[PDB]
Paper text:
Recently, a cell-autonomous model of CLL cell activation was demonstrated whereby BcR IGs from both stereotyped and non-stereotyped CLL cases could promote Ca2+ influx and nuclear factor-κB target gene transcription without the addition of exogenous antigen. We demonstrate that BcR IGs derived from both indolent and aggressive CLL cases interact homotypically via their combining sites, binding to distinct internal epitopes in each subset of patients.
The Fab surface areas buried on complex formation (558 and 597 Å2 for CLL183 and CLL240, respectively) are within the range for antibodies in complex with their specific, high-affinity protein antigens. Distinctive features of the interaction are a salt bridge between the CDR3H residue Arg107H and Glu16H from VH FR1, the insertion of the side chain of Tyr108H in a hydrophobic pocket, hydrogen bonds and van der Waals' contacts between residues Tyr109H, Tyr110H and Tyr111H and the surface of the CH1 domain. Using analytical ultracentrifugation (AUC), we observed that both Fabs from the CLL183 and CLL240 receptors displayed concentration-dependent association in solution. Next, we engineered and expressed in recombinant form two mutants of the CLL183 Fab designed to disrupt the intermolecular interactions observed in the crystal structures. No self-association could be detected for either the CLL183 mutant Fabs Glu16HAla (mutated at a key amino acid of the epitope, indicated FR) and Arg107HAla/Tyr108HAla (bearing a double mutation in the paratope region, indicated CDR), thus confirming that the contacts observed in the experimental crystal structures recapitulate the actual interactions occurring in solution. Indeed, residue Lys214H, whose side chain in the IgG CH1 domain forms hydrogen bonds that stabilize the self-interaction, is not conserved in IgMs or IgEs.
Numbering used by the authors:
A (entry chain B): 0 to 217
B (entry chain A): 1 to 139, 148 to 226
């Protein structure tokens, strides 16, 4: 039976300069027959390899800022960041090196920058006349510069809710304003597009006291 | 310090064998396990397997039937072969330095997933090279470009030949069910800039020699 490594939270928005705390529990004791406890923590910055910060629960790797510290024993472990700084945004993982094969990792915790709630400005875009010739149509819904990340889009075509005909994508958090943007893409087989008239996407976010809707028809 | 450099083809078709190699510099080739690890958005980080100086391997039980790991001591290199690949094997693959390869080194030395290769982005797909169709998303206003149905990654997207950079969000590519990628790029501009300024999205796809300059207008 593989050792399960459960991190918490999956997402951690931190105010800059404030402490941060990441939990990691294992489904089995991590204390090894040689007496050691084999638990490491990793930081991974975008487009880069994981970097080990902490090994054997509490030993800090050389060159690692002392604002990072690990602790715990047995099955309960904790990485702490005393003061979160700009360069600490990214993914953090625990790994157990006690029971193998296989070595197992936690599912990761994403440290992001907490800022104030910002409502998405919403824009809807109709299929192009150039695309309709290929026998398929794409309606795009844009949610621009919003915080926090958690958003909700629902597609309406002739005031009917859609299911499973759309894919979402999110930008990474903006470097200057700390916001997100999201695309929602409605995929239709043209015949289903001309069959109906009025198109609209309905966005639900924290920043909106009520769902905002953009629309068109043709 | 020890350093690891890796190479190998990352663009594969189903049923092919992934073949990666890692070269070791700046330290002894003995004392610790040479390790392969992979990372995908869905499954996170997964230990694939390890080998020692003497050629002794240990694999991940879920992969052991498709994994070979080998070592070439006369070159300080080690290799991964992952046979019969599918789309489920799409991931970034890393070589790393593992734990000490004896009880004493494991117990008393800091080694243990502390040095990593730069990674190899591996994509498995039955798709042949295809250039994108580029469609406008026409209109503080928002506008952009839908970049649809291309393979392989990446495309490059600019606006007005790099002159326009402010307010630009280019979303990450999504893999469509067709096995081809798609993304959108958008900008917001002042509404008064529509009658005075022209917007052009420049989309390049080097593999297919595709170069499209699509104007986006009311």
């Amino acid at each position: 039976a593989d050792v399960v490594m459960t991190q918490s939270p999956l997402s951690l928005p931190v105010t800059l300069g404030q402490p941060a705390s990441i939990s990691c529990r294992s489904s089995q004791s991590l204390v090894h027959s040689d007496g050691n406890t084999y638990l490491n923590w990793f930081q991974q910055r975008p487009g880069q390899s994981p970097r080990r910060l902490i090994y054997k629960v509490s030993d800090r790797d050389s060159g690692v800022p002392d604002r990072f510290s690990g602790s715990g024993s047995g099955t309960d472990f904790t990485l702490k960041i005393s003061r979160v700084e700009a360069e600490d945004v990214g993914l953090y993982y625990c790994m157990q090196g006690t029971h193998w094969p296989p070595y197992t990792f936690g599912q990761g915790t994403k440290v992001e920058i907490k800022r104030t709630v910002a409502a998405p400005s919403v824009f809807i875009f109709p299929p192009s006349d150039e695309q309709l010739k290929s026998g398929t149509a794409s309606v795009v819904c844009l949610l621009n510069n919003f915080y926090p990340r958690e958003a909700k889009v629902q597609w309406k075509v002739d005031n009917a809710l859609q299911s499973g005909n759309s894919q979402e994508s999110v930008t990474e958090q903006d470097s200057k304003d700390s916001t997100y943007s999201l695309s929602s893409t409605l995929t239709l087989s043209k015949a289903d597009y001309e069959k109906h008239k009025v198109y609209a996407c309905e966005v639900t976010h924290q920043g909106l006291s009520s769902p905002v809707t953009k629309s068109f028809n043709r | 310090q020890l350093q690891l450099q890796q190479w190998g083809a990352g663009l594969l078709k189903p049923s092919e064998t992934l073949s990666l190699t890692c070269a070791v510099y700046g330290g002894s080739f003995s004392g610790y396990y040479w390790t392969w690890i992979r990372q995908s958005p869905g499954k996170g980080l997964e230990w694939i397997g390890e080998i020692n100086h003497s050629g002794s391997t240990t694999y991940n039980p879920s992969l052991k039937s498709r994994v070979t790991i080998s070592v070439d001591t006369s070159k300080n290199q080690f290799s991964l072969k992952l046979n019969s690949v599918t789309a489920a094997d799409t991931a970034v693959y890393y070589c790393a330095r593992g734990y000490g390869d004896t009880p004493t080194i494991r117990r008393y030395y800091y080694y243990g997933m502390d040095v990593w290769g730069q990674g190899t982005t591996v994509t498995v797909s039955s798709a042949s090279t295809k250039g994108p169709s580029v469609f406008p998303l026409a209109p503080t206003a928002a506008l952009g470009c839908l970049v649809k149905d291309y393979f392989p990654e990446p495309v490059t997207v600019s606006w007005n030949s790099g002159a326009l950079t402010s307010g630009v969000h280019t979303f990450p590519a999504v893999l469509q069910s067709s096995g081809l990628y798609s993304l959108s790029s958008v900008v917001t501009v002042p509404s008064s800039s529509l009658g005075t300024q022209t917007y052009i999205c420049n989309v390049n796809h080097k593999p297919s020699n595709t170069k499209v300059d699509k104007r986006v207008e009311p």
